[PDB]
Design a protein around this ligand. Structure first.
Ligand SMILES: Cc1cc2nc3c(=O)[nH]c(=O)nc-3n(C[C@H](O)[C@H](O)[C@H](O)COP(=O)(O)O)c2cc1C
Ligand SMILES: C[C@]12C=CC(=O)C=C1CC[C@@H]1[C@@H]2CC[C@]2(C)C(=O)CC[C@@H]12
Length: 364
């Protein structure tokens, strides 16, 4: 029956009935041209509406933000209209959903950028990894990332504004909250990490400079909507998609969190490790984070229900976001509550394709 995973939690402007959240999961099944959400995607989210909180797959704040074929956007009328149906479906089932907004930065390819030009980032350094495009038959394919163009100083205000606008669109689209994707090596993290940021202006160098952009974004969206509607996901400890967190990751992470706390935002979502290995968070560190943020804290990364109960019981985190278990178990809440077995995962269909391996996993 579990001790606390199934107890309500106030998350900013809304209230989750349980602490089992669905982590943001890129599935690359949107319509192109237009990067438009689909009815199928609506069904997928609706099947998982019993989650304490649904965090959508990463969504573009602009066309320039696009880095993967099939990923949705929230910048055009068509996209807004499609998302409105998806949030309505979730609400029809009494669920809550937040839209994760990102700008992929250097984790992109020129073929899917506006005008077919090079993607942008903090510096002109290749991410040295690959992204997902679609072939002539619409099938997902891996391709090496394009070397980025360093953003000009006078272009940064435009970036902040795209985030601001997307949040405004998210509000009209019916989303309950918004989660800024400031992790996993995407644009915001590109600026935060010294390994990917070699700028010599006020957006590079010190942690204060490196964190400038993300903080300007946080202030802009808090002003556009409301601080209790804002969430942010970070992955400040370890290495992700080739972007590490610098020689003083812990101290830099604590600085960022204290700054975020000043805005009084809804929640802090901590992605502890990427899909590959990663040194685990020490309780000492969890305590330092805990005492610096006064909003909800969500833990994530290969979590087990037992680990969730342990850390929530110790009062270190408030909720847990499950990724892969949610892909395969729409009614994960009921299964964890009843201690039932889960459906096996089918990794080959995580990205692209159709209903198979998407709205395919049965509920109890
Ligand atoms: C197919 C797939 C897509 C993902 N897409 C995103 C994404 O868009 N944004 C994000 O922040 N994390 C993303 N993640 C990371 C997950 O949110 C999560 O942190 C990760 O899967 C670890 O949790 P798990 O062990 O419970 O699956 C993705 C993971 C998978 C497996
Ligand atoms: C899991 C992930 C990580 C962090 C994040 O924020 C969002 C995603 C979704 C896309 C995958 C990426 C990891 C790298 C992947 C597997 C590739 O090489 C192609 C598809 C990518």
């Amino acid at each position: 029956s579990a001790e606390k995973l199934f107890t309500p939690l106030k998350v900013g402007a809304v209230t989750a009935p349980n602490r089992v959240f669905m982590a943001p999961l890129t599935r690359l099944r949107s319509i192109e041209p237009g990067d438009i959400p689909t009815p199928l995607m609506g069904e997928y989210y609706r099947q998982r509406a019993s989650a304490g909180l649904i965090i959508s797959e990463a969504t573009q704040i602009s066309a320039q933000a696009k880095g993967y074929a099939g990923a949705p956007g929230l910048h055009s009328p068509e996209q807004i209209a499609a998302w409105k149906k998806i949030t309505a479906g979730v609400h029809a089932e009494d669920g809550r959903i937040a839209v994760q907004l990102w700008h992929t930065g250097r984790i992109s390819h020129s073929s899917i950028q506006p005008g077919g030009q090079a993607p942008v980032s903090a510096s002109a350094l290749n991410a040295n990894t690959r992204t997902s495009l679609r072939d002539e038959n619409g099938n997902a394919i891996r391709v090496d990332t394009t070397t980025p163009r360093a953003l000009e100083l006078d272009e940064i205000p435009g970036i902040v504004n795209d985030f601001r606008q997307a949040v405004a669109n998210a509000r009209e689209a019916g989303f309950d909250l918004v989660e800024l994707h400031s992790a996993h090596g995407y644009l915001l993290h590109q600026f935060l990490s010294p390994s990917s940021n070699q700028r010599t202006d006020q957006y590079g160098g010190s942690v204060e400079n490196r964190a400038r952009l993300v903080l300007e974004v946080v202030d802009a969206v808090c002003n556009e909507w409301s601080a209790d509607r804002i969430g942010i996901r970070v992955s400040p400890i370890g290495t992700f998609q080739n972007v590490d967190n610098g020689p003083n990751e812990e101290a830099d992470a604590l600085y960022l969190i204290e700054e975020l706390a000043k805005r009084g935002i809804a929640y802090l979502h901590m992605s502890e490790t990427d899909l590959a290995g990663g040194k685990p968070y020490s309780e000492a560190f969890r305590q330092k984070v805990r005492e610096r943020f006064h909003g909800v804290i969500i833990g994530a990364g290969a979590y087990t229900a037992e680990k969730a109960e342990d850390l929530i019981g110790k009062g270190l985190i408030d909720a847990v976001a499950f990724g892969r278990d949610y892909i395969a178990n729409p009614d994960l809440v009921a299964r964890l509550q009843k201690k039932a077995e889960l459906n096996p995962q089918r990794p080959e269909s995580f990205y692209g394709g159709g209903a198979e391996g998407y709205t395919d996993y049965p509920s109890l």
